[PDB]
């Protein structure tokens, strides 16, 4: 079954177990393999994998990681993925002193949005967008990955799992524990990610839910009904040069992504027009 794959090295661990880089002995294709242990006497195939696999089989966009195969055994499941050099977080870290050029930022954000818009157009929420889950190659691409915390939504949305999105990237309507959330939460995350590519530090690095709330308020302005109609009624509500290097258009897009009100928060579709991406190119990254 995996007779044709040769293990090269471990590249990370996720919900499931271990992700490895491997090579197809017969084709030379370098791949990433995700080993998922099956609970054959207890809880069977994890729902994480049921969602990841079923949703990735539908999404075939140049900015969504490609699942090339699913190799079954009695006891193990291997997901075969296309290999991407690294994740945005490692790249950011590599670039903390040099910086990431503005053209490449622009390109990465453009792609991320094209990817994400495809998700939304196909009733899928990602719900875990953070730099560690975004993969880049050496030819200047970026792609959404790790769709284990993803959900196929209905219209209108109903109540989904609340424990969603790493704290730092978690939108205010999840924090405050609102009953319903939707495609807006992914945009928030991307907005947090835009900011991070520009500064190479995270925008809202909280130690707790309460700290996270305070971190947002002080930056975007204590939300009020005039800015976020409803903020005061939200279940857990209670009594600039954010990015120096960034142009006038940049700052406009960012605010629209980081809007408090999920209804007023820009869609991925809208954002793909924002003047910021009028001169977008596809630079190669320095790595």
């Amino acid at each position: 079954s995996m007779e044709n794959f040769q293990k090269v090295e471990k590249i990370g661990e996720g919900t499931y177990g271990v992700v490895y880089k491997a090579r197809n002995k017969l084709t030379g294709e370098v791949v990433a393999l995700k080993k998922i242990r099956l609970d054959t006497e207890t809880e069977g195939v994890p729902s994480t994998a049921i969602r990841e696999i079923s949703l990735l089989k539908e999404l075939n966009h140049p900015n969504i990681v490609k699942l090339l195969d699913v190799i079954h055994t009695e006891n193990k499941l291997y997901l075969v993925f296309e290999f991407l050099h690294q994740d945005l977080k490692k790249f950011m870290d590599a670039s903390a002193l040099t910086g990431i050029p503005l053209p490449l930022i622009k390109s990465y954000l453009f792609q991320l949005l094209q990817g994400l818009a495809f998700c939304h157009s196909h009733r899928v929420l990602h719900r875990d967008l953070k730099p560690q889950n975004l993969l880049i190659n050496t030819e200047g691409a970026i792609k959404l990955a790790d769709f284990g915390l993803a959900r196929a939504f209905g219209v209108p949305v109903r109540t989904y799992t609340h424990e969603v999105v790493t704290l730092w990237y978690r939108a205010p309507e999840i924090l405050l524990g609102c009953k319903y959330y939707s495609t807006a939460v992914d945009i928030w995350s991307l907005g947090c990610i835009f900011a991070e590519m520009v500064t190479r530090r995270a925008l809202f690095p909280g130690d707790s839910e309460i700290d996270q709330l305070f971190r947002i308020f002080r930056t975007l302005g204590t939300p009020d009904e005039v800015v976020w109609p409803g903020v005061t009624s939200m279940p857990d509500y209670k009594p600039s040069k954010v990015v120096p290097p960034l142009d006038e258009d940049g700052r406009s897009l960012l605010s629209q992504m980081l809007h408090y009100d999920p209804n007023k928060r820009i869609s991925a579709k809208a954002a793909l027009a924002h003047p910021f991406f009028q001169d977008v190119t596809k630079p190669v990254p320095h790595l």
Partner: protein, 259 residues
């Protein structure tokens, strides 16, 4: 607002329509099953309705389950004594897909009265996944309904309830309802309910969205008008039972129109 994904509501509808064809069961599958029948499938679906109420599952979970079953029996000969094993495994799969807090496997074994072992359930799980090639994201009657509800004005509790009742009654009878697409059944269920509680038809705004007229929806509306009329005489009662409760505003207690 954003909970109705305004900038995507259309692309999503179009996608679901394209996908409801790909996830469509074989209309003739039961005549090619040497050992099982439409009637046995009736018992199976009826039993799944009951399980969804004891475990308080989403109705959407029930629809997926039935999709999983029809696609599985569209590809695999199954003997009667295993028909329940397939259905239990589908419900389990639909729960893992759709529910925030799915029942554990042990509860899926408990409901079969230990007709089957845990190993069998879990093995059948894997087989169902392989046969469906992990395509679990099937559009359902409900996914069309919840969209079709947003074209009411005002919103109506009883019409929404009543539409779901009819939708679920369709899941029980392969004949005729396998030869209709979910989007269609959904539309036929919406009209019938609107009329019954208000006197109003399939609205115009939905005709523009779907390309479906009352004329094109007549066959299904007929079959379904019958089902509603014969509902108290149907050998399977679990849905009626279920919709006689406040949660669904006893829409099962309502007398259907005449024509």
């Amino acid at each position: 607002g954003v909970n109705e994904v305004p900038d995507y509501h259309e692309d999503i509808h179009t996608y679901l329509r394209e996908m409801e064809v790909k996830c469509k069961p074989k209309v003739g599958y039961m005549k090619k099953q040497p050992d099982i029948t439409n009637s046995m499938r009736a018992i199976l679906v009826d039993w799944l309705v009951e399980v969804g109420e004891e475990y308080k599952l989403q109705n959407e979970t029930l629809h997926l389950a039935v999709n999983y079953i029809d696609r599985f029996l569209s590809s695999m000969s199954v003997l009667r004594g295993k028909l329940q094993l397939v259905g239990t495994a589908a419900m389990l799969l639909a729960s893992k897909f759709e529910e925030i807090y799915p029942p554990e496997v042990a509860e899926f074994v408990y409901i079969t009265d230990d007709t089957y072992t845990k190993k069998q359930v879990l093995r059948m799980e894997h087989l169902v996944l392989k046969v469906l090639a992990f395509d679990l994201a099937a559009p359902t009657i409900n996914q069309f309904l919840t969209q079709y509800f947003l074209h009411q004005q005002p919103a109506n509790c009883k019409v929404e309830s009543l539409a779901m009742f009819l939708g679920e009654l369709s899941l029980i009878d392969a004949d005729p309802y396998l030869k209709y697409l979910p989007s269609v059944i959904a539309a036929a269920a919406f009209h019938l309910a609107l009329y019954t509680v208000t006197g109003q038809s399939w609205p115009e705004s939905l005709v523009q969205k779907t390309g479906y007229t009352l004329e094109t929806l007549k066959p299904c509306l007929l079959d379904l008008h019958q089902t509603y009329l014969r509902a108290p005489q149907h050998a399977q009662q679990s849905i009626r039972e279920k919709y006689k409760n406040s949660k669904y505003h006893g829409v099962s207690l309502l007398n259907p129109p005449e024509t």
